[PDB]
Design a protein around this ligand. Structure first.
Ligand SMILES: [Mg+2]
Ligand SMILES: [Mg+2]
Ligand SMILES: [Mg+2]
Ligand SMILES: [Mg+2]
Ligand SMILES: [Mg+2]
Ligand SMILES: [Mg+2]
Ligand SMILES: [Mg+2]
Ligand SMILES: [Mg+2]
Ligand SMILES: [Mg+2]
Ligand SMILES: [Mg+2]
Ligand SMILES: [Mg+2]
Ligand SMILES: [Mg+2]
Ligand SMILES: [Mg+2]
Ligand SMILES: [Mg+2]
Ligand SMILES: [Mg+2]
Ligand SMILES: [Mg+2]
Ligand SMILES: [Mg+2]
Ligand SMILES: [Mg+2]
Ligand SMILES: [Mg+2]
Ligand SMILES: [Mg+2]
Ligand SMILES: [Mg+2]
Ligand SMILES: [Mg+2]
Ligand SMILES: [Mg+2]
Ligand SMILES: [Mg+2]
Ligand SMILES: [Mg+2]
Ligand SMILES: [Mg+2]
Ligand SMILES: [Mg+2]
Ligand SMILES: [Mg+2]
Ligand SMILES: [Mg+2]
Ligand SMILES: [Mg+2]
Ligand SMILES: [Mg+2]
Ligand SMILES: [Mg+2]
Ligand SMILES: [Mg+2]
Ligand SMILES: [Mg+2]
Ligand SMILES: [Mg+2]
Ligand SMILES: [Mg+2]
Ligand SMILES: [Mg+2]
Ligand SMILES: [Mg+2]
Ligand SMILES: [Mg+2]
Ligand SMILES: [Mg+2]
Ligand SMILES: [Mg+2]
Ligand SMILES: [Mg+2]
Ligand SMILES: [Mg+2]
Ligand SMILES: [Mg+2]
Ligand SMILES: [Mg+2]
Ligand SMILES: [Mg+2]
Ligand SMILES: [Mg+2]
Ligand SMILES: [Mg+2]
Ligand SMILES: [Mg+2]
Ligand SMILES: [Mg+2]
Ligand SMILES: [Mg+2]
Ligand SMILES: [Mg+2]
Ligand SMILES: [Mg+2]
Ligand SMILES: [Mg+2]
Ligand SMILES: [Mg+2]
Ligand SMILES: [Mg+2]
Ligand SMILES: [Mg+2]
Ligand SMILES: [Mg+2]
Ligand SMILES: [Mg+2]
Ligand SMILES: [Mg+2]
Ligand SMILES: [Mg+2]
Ligand SMILES: [Mg+2]
Ligand SMILES: [Mg+2]
Ligand SMILES: [Mg+2]
Ligand SMILES: [Mg+2]
Ligand SMILES: [Mg+2]
Ligand SMILES: [Mg+2]
Ligand SMILES: [Mg+2]
Ligand SMILES: [Mg+2]
Ligand SMILES: [Mg+2]
Ligand SMILES: [Mg+2]
Ligand SMILES: [Mg+2]
Ligand SMILES: [Mg+2]
Ligand SMILES: [Mg+2]
Ligand SMILES: [Mg+2]
Ligand SMILES: [Mg+2]
Ligand SMILES: [Mg+2]
Ligand SMILES: [Mg+2]
Ligand SMILES: [Mg+2]
Ligand SMILES: [Mg+2]
Ligand SMILES: [Mg+2]
Ligand SMILES: [Mg+2]
Ligand SMILES: [Mg+2]
Ligand SMILES: [Mg+2]
Ligand SMILES: [Mg+2]
Ligand SMILES: [Mg+2]
Ligand SMILES: [Mg+2]
Ligand SMILES: [Mg+2]
Ligand SMILES: [Mg+2]
Ligand SMILES: [Mg+2]
Ligand SMILES: [Mg+2]
Ligand SMILES: [Mg+2]
Ligand SMILES: [Mg+2]
Ligand SMILES: [Mg+2]
Ligand SMILES: [Mg+2]
Ligand SMILES: [Mg+2]
Ligand SMILES: [Mg+2]
Ligand SMILES: [Mg+2]
Ligand SMILES: [Mg+2]
Ligand SMILES: [Mg+2]
Ligand SMILES: [Mg+2]
Ligand SMILES: [Mg+2]
Ligand SMILES: [Mg+2]
Ligand SMILES: [Mg+2]
Ligand SMILES: [Mg+2]
Ligand SMILES: [Mg+2]
Ligand SMILES: [Mg+2]
Ligand SMILES: [Zn+2]
Lengths: 48, 60
RNA sequence: AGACAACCUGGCGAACUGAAACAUCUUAGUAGCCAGAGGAAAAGAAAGCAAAAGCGAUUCCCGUAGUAGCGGCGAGCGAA
RNA sequence: AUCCCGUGUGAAUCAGCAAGGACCACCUUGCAAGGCUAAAUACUCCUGGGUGACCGAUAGCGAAGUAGUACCGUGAGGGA
RNA sequence: AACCCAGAGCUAGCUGGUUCUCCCCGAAAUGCGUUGAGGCGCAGCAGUUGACUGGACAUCUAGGGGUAAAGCACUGUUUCG
RNA sequence: CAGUGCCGGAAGGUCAAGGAAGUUGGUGACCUGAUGACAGGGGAGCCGGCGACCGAAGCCCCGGUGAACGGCGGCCGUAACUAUAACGGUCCUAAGGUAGCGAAAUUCCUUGUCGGGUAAGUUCCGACCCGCACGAAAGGCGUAACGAUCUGGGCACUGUC
RNA sequence: UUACUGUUCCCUGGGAUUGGCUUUGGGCUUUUCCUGCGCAGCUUAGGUGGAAGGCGAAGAAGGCCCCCUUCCGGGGGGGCCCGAGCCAUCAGUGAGAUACCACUCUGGAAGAGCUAGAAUUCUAACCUUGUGUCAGGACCUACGGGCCAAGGGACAUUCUCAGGUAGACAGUUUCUAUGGGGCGUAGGCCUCCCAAAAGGUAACGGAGGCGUGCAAAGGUUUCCUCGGGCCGGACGGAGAUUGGCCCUCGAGUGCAAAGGCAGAAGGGAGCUUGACUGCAAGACCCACCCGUCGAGCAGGGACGAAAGUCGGCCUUAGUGA
RNA sequence: GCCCGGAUAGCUCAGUCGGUAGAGCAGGGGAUUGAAAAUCCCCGUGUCCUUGGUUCGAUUCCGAGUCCGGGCACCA
C-alpha cells in the first residue's frame, strides 16, 4: 500500500560521518542499519 | 425525443411520512410534446391520499 | 531404502458430457498421474453450537429435506 | 459473515480477545496463533468357516488341459 | 495431428434391430410456437376410468350474410356515336 | 506516405492501480419531545460510502519511411474528305500505370484481324492493340548453356495405319 | 482474420528486495510582514473585539533621494538630513481611527516544515566478470567453495498489484427461407383481395401501410354544413376574398386501407382535465402465453339550467414475455 | 448515465478582481496598378443563451431552464 519508512532506533558504538560520536542514540532506515552498520560492528540495534 | 414521459406529482403532498390513514406521494405519469408546449404542465387530478382533487405539477 | 488388490491421506488436476448451441455454470475436485502411511486412515478435546431455554471432543447411520437457500435465478447444485 | 492462502502493512493480554451471516451498541458463549490420542465407519490381492429361487464348458474368472500360455506387435499392449 | 491404455457402456434430436398366443376398441399425417423445418411442447383426433346429461339420424321454421348469377346506382375500365 | 504497419517526437487532450485534502452515512454515552404503545436530535470511538488534486506507458496528436501492407481514375470537345486525336475543358482522388511487353500459363466476346507454314491449320511462329482483367524485387524485359519439361514443324525410319 | 472471450511473450506505473549525501523543485505551512478606488468625506472606508490611551530619543512630523508594486490616485520602504510632533467621541458612516493590539481573509515575500517528482553523485544491498589467489591424501586453466580485486549500483533482476499489448496461443460462435449458389432481399403488427354470402384458411400469389401523433386532434355544453357545376363583381387570371341559383352527401375524418359517419363521428365557439382512484356481473377470441367489450357500485370531480354525458382519441396498426 | 468547457458583430474567439462591449476575416469606399494583386488606410452592425437573485447599478457574481462542444463509464 502506502510505503512506510522503517525506523530502527540504534546506538552507535563508533564515530561515523553524518551520524555522530561513539555511544550515540539515533533512528535510521532498516536497509541502512542491516546492510551497512550491522555487519561492520559499527552500530547496535536497541530494544532495552 | 421530442415527445417525452413526464411525471406529474401532487404539490401538497408531504414526503415526511404523514400521520393519517394512508400515506404516500401521489404521482401520475403521462406524455408531453417538449417542443410544442415548453411550459411546465400543470394539471388538476385526483390524489388517493388527500382524497380531494389536487393540483399536480411536474418534476425535473 | 524396495514390494504391496481395493480402501485412505496429501499434491497436481482434465475432457468428452449436461445446459437440447455456448462462454459463467455442469461433468468434478471425478479419472488419471506423483508421493505417503495404516490395518484402517483422516478428523478430534470447543477462540464450538444455540437463543434468552439449553448443550457439552471427533467420526458414522436414520431423519430434518429435496425444506432454508445458491443459480446465465437457466441446466442444475443443496445445507444446518 | 465463518474458514484457508500470495503481495504489503500490522495489534491487544483477561479493566483483554474472538464468535454469534455486512457493520455498531448490549448481552450470551468461548479462549486461536504448541503437540498426541482407542472405538463406532471404508475396503478385498487374500485366510478360515458358513450359506446360494448363483453358472455348468458360447455360461462361470481372460483361463475346468502349456493361460496371461500359443500366437500377434519394435514397444507400450493385445490374447484365444 | 502417431500409436497403446484409461476417463468410457462418452455423445449420436441419426440409421439398423426389439423374440409366445387369442379377444375387444382403434387413429393421424391438421392448427400454433420453436436456432425450427426429418425433432419437440400444447391443441385437434385414440384407449381405458368416472361424473353429469339427452340426444343423434330425419322434418320444418327463423336469423344475419354479399358468393354464383345478375347490374351499371358508385369506383375504375372501354368502344363508337 | 491519405488508409495500414513500422520508426522517431515531445507541447496539449485522454489516461489504471495506488495515494489524498475534504465531505457524507450507520451506530451511540447522552439531551429533549410525546394522550402512543413510542419518537426526534447527538460527543468520543468503531464501521461504511463518496472523493477535488497527484498519478506511467499506451491512444488521440506531429514528422519520416514502398526491394513495408498495398494503390496506381472518369467525362467531354477539337485538326482542308471520311476518319482518328498530338491539343484544350471539366470531375475526382493519397496519386491516377512511366520504361518495357502485349489475343500472353493473363483475351471474356474469340476459331479477333492480317501475314507465314499446310492440298486443307480452333494448335504453331511474326505482327497489330480494341490490355473484359500485363507491368516493374508477390520483380519488368532480354538471354548463351541446360531440361526423362511444355508446345509446332521437318529429314531418316518403321505393321501406328 | 479488424468474429467473441480470454491466455502468454513484451512495454509501463505502485508496493517489496532498498541504502547514504547533495541539489533543483510542484502543492500545503511556521513565526512574521505585504494588501482592499458603495457614496455622503479630514479619503483607494478590512470585517470583528480589548478600546482614552499610544508612537519617540534602543531618536517622529517636515523636505533631498534609492527601490519596488501600480487602477502613474497613490501606497509599503532602505540611506541621509530633520528636531518635539503625527493625535480620539471630535460631524459624517450599516461597520473607527494610520494612537495601539489580538486569531487572520484578497494575492506577494522570506528564512524554516511535509510529500513527491527530477537530476547528480556515493558504496554497503544487489548484479557481472577474473588461466587473480588460497584450499583437503591429491587436483579444481574440471563445474564449484573461501578471500581479494575489477566493472556496474540502489538502477537492474526476482516477487506481488495495475494499465497497455501479438491469431503467438486456447476455447468457442457464424439463424431460417431465397434460385435447396454467390448476392442483396425477406423474418413483428395492420387494411384489402385471393377466401368458395358464419368464423377460420396456404403459396417466393396480387396491392399497400406501422414502430406514432395531438395539452387539444381529449372531456363536455351549444351552434353550424360540406364539396361540384352555372352566373355577377376593381386589379383577379382556370384558381384567393364576396353575392346568388341548381345537384344532395360525390368533401372531410392527423397518417394506409377497409368499414362507418349529414342538423352527423365533419366545421366552430365557451368552460374544462374522466388522458381519474378503488373496482366489477357477464361475454367474445381462444393450444398456451396474451388480447378485446363491458352493464353496475363507491369515492372525489368536469361540463351543463337540468336530464345526463365523461375511465383518452369514428374503429381496426403505433409494439416486446 | 456522470465529468468538464462554451452560447459575445454576418463568420472565428479576446475578456477588468462589476462602472467603455472588443479583435481578426466577410462586406462598403479610396487610390494603389495603363489594367490585375500585393500595398494600404477609413466605415457599418450587438437584448454579451433564456430567466429570476445579488448589487448604487452586471457580459462579469449566483440559482433554475435550453442548446452546443469533448472526456469517462456499465453484465435487462
Ligand atoms: Mg516498509
Ligand atoms: Mg517405502
Ligand atoms: Mg517408490
Ligand atoms: Mg502395508
Ligand atoms: Mg465444457
Ligand atoms: Mg465443449
Ligand atoms: Mg451441450
Ligand atoms: Mg445438445
Ligand atoms: Mg476398526
Ligand atoms: Mg490417526
Ligand atoms: Mg473434555
Ligand atoms: Mg483444550
Ligand atoms: Mg468461528
Ligand atoms: Mg454458525
Ligand atoms: Mg473475523
Ligand atoms: Mg488455500
Ligand atoms: Mg499483546
Ligand atoms: Mg464460543
Ligand atoms: Mg491461548
Ligand atoms: Mg483462527
Ligand atoms: Mg489447541
Ligand atoms: Mg492428528
Ligand atoms: Mg467348445
Ligand atoms: Mg469359457
Ligand atoms: Mg454341451
Ligand atoms: Mg506439423
Ligand atoms: Mg486422430
Ligand atoms: Mg465421463
Ligand atoms: Mg452410450
Ligand atoms: Mg460405443
Ligand atoms: Mg457433441
Ligand atoms: Mg371395428
Ligand atoms: Mg386427411
Ligand atoms: Mg433433425
Ligand atoms: Mg403430443
Ligand atoms: Mg377418446
Ligand atoms: Mg337475406
Ligand atoms: Mg337466407
Ligand atoms: Mg348489398
Ligand atoms: Mg368479399
Ligand atoms: Mg361474376
Ligand atoms: Mg358505369
Ligand atoms: Mg361508365
Ligand atoms: Mg500511404
Ligand atoms: Mg504513413
Ligand atoms: Mg505521415
Ligand atoms: Mg508511436
Ligand atoms: Mg505531452
Ligand atoms: Mg485524470
Ligand atoms: Mg482513486
Ligand atoms: Mg478522509
Ligand atoms: Mg452521522
Ligand atoms: Mg433513540
Ligand atoms: Mg440517531
Ligand atoms: Mg493527471
Ligand atoms: Mg501519458
Ligand atoms: Mg509534412
Ligand atoms: Mg516499386
Ligand atoms: Mg471535318
Ligand atoms: Mg491539360
Ligand atoms: Mg487532356
Ligand atoms: Mg484549367
Ligand atoms: Mg482532393
Ligand atoms: Mg499525397
Ligand atoms: Mg500532388
Ligand atoms: Mg505505354
Ligand atoms: Mg518518354
Ligand atoms: Mg514490340
Ligand atoms: Mg487465335
Ligand atoms: Mg510473364
Ligand atoms: Mg489481362
Ligand atoms: Mg478463347
Ligand atoms: Mg498461306
Ligand atoms: Mg491464318
Ligand atoms: Mg495437332
Ligand atoms: Mg503469338
Ligand atoms: Mg492491373
Ligand atoms: Mg504479375
Ligand atoms: Mg511489388
Ligand atoms: Mg520470376
Ligand atoms: Mg532462352
Ligand atoms: Mg535435373
Ligand atoms: Mg542422312
Ligand atoms: Mg502386326
Ligand atoms: Mg515493476
Ligand atoms: Mg524501491
Ligand atoms: Mg564496487
Ligand atoms: Mg577456479
Ligand atoms: Mg574463484
Ligand atoms: Mg561506480
Ligand atoms: Mg527497482
Ligand atoms: Mg495484464
Ligand atoms: Mg482459433
Ligand atoms: Mg484478441
Ligand atoms: Mg363459406
Ligand atoms: Mg367467410
Ligand atoms: Mg396468405
Ligand atoms: Mg375541443
Ligand atoms: Mg373569380
Ligand atoms: Mg386516407
Ligand atoms: Mg372511406
Ligand atoms: Mg362535433
Ligand atoms: Mg350508472
Ligand atoms: Mg360506466
Ligand atoms: Mg361518481
Ligand atoms: Mg354546477
Ligand atoms: Mg373528436
Ligand atoms: Zn396528495
Amino acid at each position: 500500500q502506502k510505503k512506510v519508512k522503517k525506523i530502527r532506533k540504534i546506538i552507535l558504538k563508533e564515530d561515523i560521518p553524518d551520524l555522530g560520536k561513539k555511544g550515540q542514540l539515533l533512528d535510521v532506515r532498516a536497509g541502512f542499519l542491516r546492510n551497512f552498520l550491522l555487519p561492520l560492528g559499527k552500530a547496535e540495534v536497541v530494544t532495552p | 425525443d421530442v415527445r417525452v414521459k413526464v411525471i406529474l406529482e401532487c404539490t401538497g403532498c408531504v414526503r415526511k411520512s404523514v400521520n393519517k390513514g394512508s400515506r404516500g406521494v401521489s404521482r401520475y405519469i403521462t406524455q408531453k410534446n417538449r417542443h410544442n408546449t415548453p411550459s411546465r404542465l400543470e394539471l388538476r387530478k385526483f390524489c388517493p391520499y388527500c382524497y380531494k382533487h389536487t393540483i399536480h405539477g411536474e418534476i425535473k
